[PDB]
Amino acid sequence: GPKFPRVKNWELGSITYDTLCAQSQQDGPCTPRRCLGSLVLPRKLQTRPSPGPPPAEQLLSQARDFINQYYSSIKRSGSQAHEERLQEVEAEVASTGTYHLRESELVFGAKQAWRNAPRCVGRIQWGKLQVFDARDCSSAQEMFTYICNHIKYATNRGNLRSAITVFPQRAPGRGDFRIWNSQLVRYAGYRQQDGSVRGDPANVEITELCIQHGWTPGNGRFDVLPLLLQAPDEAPELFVLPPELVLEVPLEHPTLEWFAALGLRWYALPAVSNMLLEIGGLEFSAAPFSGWYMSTEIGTRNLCDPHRYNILEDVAVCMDLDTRTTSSLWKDKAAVEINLAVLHSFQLAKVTIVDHHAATVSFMKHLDNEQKARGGCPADWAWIVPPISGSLTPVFHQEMVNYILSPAFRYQPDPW
């Protein structure tokens, strides 16, 4: 039949063909010889620092494709404005080597980038994104102001709103605008004498970096790290987020009264700050974006991963489970309660959150929408299926095709 990947849902027995992948312009890490789909960072997308200006020919092509996408989205392909805009970009790249996006083009691209994110399960919200333009930002201090406004607007006292702030694009031979921290909010990770870690092991390097740069460290398990902001060609400056702006939620269990005595907690705003936003060839090295948490991110990965807070054993001991034998499923039990505690605490504190069931169901709806609107949807199965109760959610039974579409959010090397 159709000359495109046949995709099946084994629960409902339904079939679809992905024709959108034909639009992919960039190769992933797989080949007919072997599948590398489970690799977190295959060295492909990896936007490695490419200092010297990019091949005008290369950029022009990416730029024309994007502009075509833009005019198509407003239903004006082939129009005079479309052709003139095309001429304008080529002219500009011709005389300066690069070009700039109009306001509405940036907004469209930011949303398309989210829309094209293979690893995001919250894409049903893609059309609703507050885009803060900060391409005028000229200092590390101004980056801090912008970021604070982002946090304030997105947190909105617990009624979270998706948002993104776009700082100046990478320029010919000039320094990049960078946010060193992987997220706007991160708990410190203190390397101990015995070799262990206090706080979040995931943040040991950035914590040591903040210290090397003048931050006086605390000794808690949930210390909010300061931000290391870097304006072009300048060393990074240290900024401490005003406590009132970082909304947190103490964690308690709905029936296990002792859980609250554990003193656990998590922050409300999930905001990635280390990714690169690419649109029509243009590269925005600093463009933090945020939505709202899916309970398993906090309850399963952050709190239960071996290399994170690793609280599984502590919680099992409290539930008086048999932690000496795997077959007691003590790990599974503690994990469920820990996750329930996150959903409970967030609801109580009236902070936005979505469980893995609700989330995946909404993603199934998103897949339907996209099948009709674009003939497919790039999705990374391993990342879409939740870390717990995998086959209990609908996405587990849904085959998925993964591929790279631009605009996109890509990983980028650490500035240090």
Ligand X SMILES: C[C@H](O)[C@H](O)[C@H]1CNc2nc(N)[nH]c(=O)c2N1
Ligand Y SMILES: N=C(N)SCCc1ccc(CCSC(=N)N)cc1
Q: Which residues in this chain contact ligand HEM in the complex, by CB under 6 A?
A: 114, 117, 119-122, 125, 129, 162, 164, 272, 289, 291-292, 294, 297, 354, 359, 383, 409
* Residues of span 40-59 touching ligand X by CB under 6 A: 40
Asked if 200 is part of the footprint of ligand Y (rule: CB under 6 A), the reply reads no
In the three-class reduction of DSSP (H, G, I as helix; E, B as strand; rest coil), residue 239 is classed as strand
* Residues of span 259-318 touching ligand Y by CB under 6 A: 270-272, 274-275, 289-294, 297
> Which residue, 119 or 374, is less far from ligand Y as judged by CB?
119
Which one is catalytic: 21, 120, 137, 377?
120
229 interface partner picked from ligand Y, ligand HEM, ligand X, none, CB below 5 to 8 A per type: none
Q: Is 309 annotated as belonging to a binding site?
A: no
Does the annotation count 377 as an active-site position?
Answer: no
Asked if 37 is part of the footprint of Zn ion (rule: CB under 5 A), the reply reads yes
Asked if 17 is part of the footprint of ligand X (rule: CB under 6 A), the reply reads no
Per-residue x/- mask for ligand X, residues 347 to 386, rule CB under 6 A?
Answer: -----------------------------------xx---
Among all chains, which residue has been given the structure tokens 């960072």?
41
Q: Is 167 annotated as belonging to a binding site?
A: no
Q: Which of 42, 240, 246, 20 is nearest to 144 (CA)?
A: 240
According to DSSP, residue 15 is labeled E
CA angle 87, 93, 94 (to 5 degrees): 85
The CA distance from 378 to 41, in Å, is 17
Which one is catalytic: 115, 123, 178, 186?
123
Q: Report in angstroms the alpha-carbon separations of 236 from 28, 134, 207, 227.
A: 33, 18, 14, 9
Q: To the nearest whole angstrom, how small is the minimum distance from the Cβ of residue 6 to ligand X?
A: 13
The CA distance from 349 to 390, in Å, is 28
Is residue 143 within 8 A of residue 236, CB to CB? The reply is no
In order, the DSSP letters of 102-144 are -HHHHHHHHHHHHHT-TT-TTGGGTT--EEEE-TT--SHHHHH
Annotated binding site for heme b: 120, 411
Which residues are tagged catalytic? Answer: 120, 123, 292, 297
Site residues for ligand Y per CB under 6 A? 182-183, 270-272, 274-275, 289-294, 297
